[PDB]
Amino acid sequence: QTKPLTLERTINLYPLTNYTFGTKEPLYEKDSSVAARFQRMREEFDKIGMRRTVEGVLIVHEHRLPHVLLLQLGTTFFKLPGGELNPGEDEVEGLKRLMTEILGRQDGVLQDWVIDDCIGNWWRPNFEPPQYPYIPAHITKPKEHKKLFLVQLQEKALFAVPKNYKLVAAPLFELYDNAPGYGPIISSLPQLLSRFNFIYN
Amino acid sequence: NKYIQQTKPLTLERTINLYPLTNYTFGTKEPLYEKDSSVAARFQRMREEFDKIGMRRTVEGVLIVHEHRLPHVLLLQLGTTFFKLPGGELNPGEDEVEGLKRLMTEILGRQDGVLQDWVIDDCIGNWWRPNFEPPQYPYIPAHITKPKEHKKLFLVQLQEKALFAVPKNYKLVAAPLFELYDNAPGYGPIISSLPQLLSRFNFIYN
Amino acid sequence: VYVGSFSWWTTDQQLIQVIRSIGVYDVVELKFAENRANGQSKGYAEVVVVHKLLELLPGKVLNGEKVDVRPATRQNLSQFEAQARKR
Amino acid sequence: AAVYVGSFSWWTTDQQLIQVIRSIGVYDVVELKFAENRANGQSKGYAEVVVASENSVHKLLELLPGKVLNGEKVDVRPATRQNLSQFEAQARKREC
């Protein structure tokens, strides 16, 4: 291409009709309560250090607009596929492992995840729910670093969703300025994806 | 004659050098007035021009410094609560980046002979105005085939030190990212989402 | 004139071509009702040229649904707005 | 057992507070919790220091007051509701 890739990044999107969706056994969280969540985070912080989380943003197109694939628990709770990196693990290899754990097929046929773009970073300064897209100045030791990547999909694929979750294709306008519905990270994705030159195949 | 250098590793991880706020200074120059000062005048001209040349193409630059290892975005303040990024309208067929270099030199370029050199390698985001009205979005709504304005944002890397010349009716100020974050009421939707848009960058605090 | 209801991905270009096929080439401007918060179309539009659109345009099917054309009034805007949020 | 320490700038760090605490011989800090604006994470310039022992609370109360963080001398008080109210009122009075 003529422009530097830093100035213009082009991404192939495929229509939602190119993809199929199944279900598999439920996948339960490592922590059974918020209290238990932050207790483990604290213990791992002392034993290992900062938690390293990676999440993937998977995009399809329908009706002229990019749609992000979200995991829904229940009515109101939404998350990106991803999770915790192991000590020393490469971020990209780690996200591919996690995507396979979460959405991989029971019949062993592998998805081909392509991950060439960081879209943002969120930092948890304390053992508490708030996260910011920067490290506050008084915090030299954040407790969690969450890194978001665009995951380029193959032209066609089957995604197997743990049956305790629903996979939804959310259009960008549903997310935009909707922190009450989706939280600050998901609701910022329209902004974070705006730089990409999407090709609607 | 020179030695052939090894390639710089090609990665989409972007590392950006920041320098202390106090490395940057400014002199004053003659006031600047935008083409439109009222809302009604803004949208009248936008309508008129849309018929002649089509979609307005705006480009804006995000200039970053640091204090206390927190990035700060440089803003132009025209009023108690009125802020903009350096930038403006491209001429017909003008290249986005060279146009932003022109606009930045017009607004902030030093007046004492030394040529300002802007380094612009990164697109940060895009905003579209579907109608001749205030709303802008980070996507094109599905029903809109002909947006009225396309605004593109770029990260402009600064040299270690720089002197700007600021129009005397403006102030140049440095906004910590925490001042912008979730502050759309104070800064609008574009400036207030810069923390999120800048979060992907690996900043080095020199 | 008001026209609707149709889906949020029905474009101004699609709406225009359906208007030309009955013989209305005197269209000045199309304006969709929109959610201002996120720019989503509410599925109806004010068309500005009249009686060609009121008569020949209804009974046309756009992206699946039948279009209802009616004259531009406060009465008719409340009906399309009430219909919009009945969805 | 805990104390409040303040007031100091919003760029006074966790590391600087831990180093001054170490400098008075206290090594059983269980938690440093800065008072923060939740909306944007900015420090409001005081912190709760939770320690494992009353011996450390005694040391903090005697040895830490007067020590300097980024040009300011710190006050240290027992972490009671009254003292929290007083630190927060001081922080609100600085925000202006």
Swiss-Prot record, chain A:
GO biological process, alphabetically ordered: cell differentiation; co-transcriptional mRNA 3'-end processing, cleavage and polyadenylation pathway; mRNA 3'-end processing; mRNA alternative polyadenylation; mRNA processing; positive regulation of pro-B cell differentiation; positive regulation of stem cell differentiation; post-transcriptional regulation of gene expression
Any Pfam family: NUDIX_2
N6-acetyllysine: residues bearing it: 3, 30
Residue numbers spanned by region Necessary for RNA-binding: 1-121
Keywords: Acetylation, Cytoplasm, Differentiation, Methylation, mRNA processing, Nucleus, Phosphoprotein, RNA-binding
Gene Ontology CC: centriolar satellite; centrosome; cytoplasm; mRNA cleavage and polyadenylation specificity factor complex; mRNA cleavage factor complex; nuclear body; nucleoplasm; nucleus
Mutagenesis or variant effect for residue 77 to A: Reduces affinity for UGUA RNA by 99%
Modified residues (Phosphotyrosine): 14
Tissue expression pattern: Expressed in the heart, brain, placenta, lung, liver, skeletal muscle, kidney and pancreas.
Site annotation Interaction with RNA: residues: 29, 37
Superkingdom, taxonomy of origin: Eukaryota
GO MF term list: chromatin binding; histone deacetylase binding; identical protein binding; mRNA 3'-UTR AU-rich region binding; mRNA binding; protein homodimerization activity; RNA binding
Region of interest called Interaction with RNA, as start-end residue ranges on this chain: 76-78
Function comment: Component of the cleavage factor Im (CFIm) complex that functions as an activator of the pre-mRNA 3'-end cleavage and polyadenylation processing required for the maturation of pre-mRNA into functional mRNAs. CFIm contributes to the recruitment of multiprotein complexes on specific sequences on the pre-mRNA 3'-end, so called cleavage and polyadenylation signals (pA signals). Most pre-mRNAs contain multiple pA signals, resulting in alternative cleavage and polyadenylation (APA) producing mRNAs with variable 3'-end formation.
Quaternary organization: Homodimer (via N- and C-terminus); binds RNA as homodimer. Component of the cleavage factor Im (CFIm) complex which is a heterotetramer composed of two subunits of NUDT21/CPSF5 and two subunits of CPSF6 or CPSF7 or a heterodimer of CPSF6 and CPSF7. The cleavage factor Im (CFIm) complex associates with the CPSF and CSTF complexes to promote the assembly of the core mRNA 3'-processing machinery. Interacts with CPSF6 (via the RRM domain); this interaction is direct and enhances binding to RNA. Interacts with CPSF7. Interacts with FIP1L1; this interaction occurs in a RNA sequence-specific manner.
Name the record gives this protein: Cleavage and polyadenylation specificity factor subunit 5
Gene label: NUDT21
From Swiss-Prot, chain D:
Domain RRM: 1-81
Modification note: Phosphorylated. Asymmetrically dimethylated on arginine residues by PRMT1.
Disulfide bridge positions per record: none
Subcellular location: Nucleus; Cytoplasm
Record text about domains: Contains an Arg/Ser-rich domain composed of arginine-serine dipeptide repeats within the C-terminal region that is necessary and sufficient for activating mRNA 3'-processing.
Subunit structure: Component of the cleavage factor Im (CFIm) complex which is a heterotetramer composed of two subunits of NUDT21/CPSF5 and two subunits of CPSF6 or CPSF7 or a heterodimer of CPSF6 and CPSF7. The cleavage factor Im (CFIm) complex associates with the CPSF and CSTF complexes to promote the assembly of the core mRNA 3'-processing machinery. Interacts with NUDT21/CPSF5.
Main function: Component of the cleavage factor Im (CFIm) complex that functions as an activator of the pre-mRNA 3'-end cleavage and polyadenylation processing required for the maturation of pre-mRNA into functional mRNAs. CFIm contributes to the recruitment of multiprotein complexes on specific sequences on the pre-mRNA 3'-end, so called cleavage and polyadenylation signals (pA signals). Most pre-mRNAs contain multiple pA signals, resulting in alternative cleavage and polyadenylation (APA) producing mRNAs with variable 3'-end formation.
Family, as annotated: Belongs to the RRM CPSF6/7 family.
Protein name: Cleavage and polyadenylation specificity factor subunit 7
Organism (species): Homo sapiens (Human)
Span covered, complete protein: 82 to 177 of 471
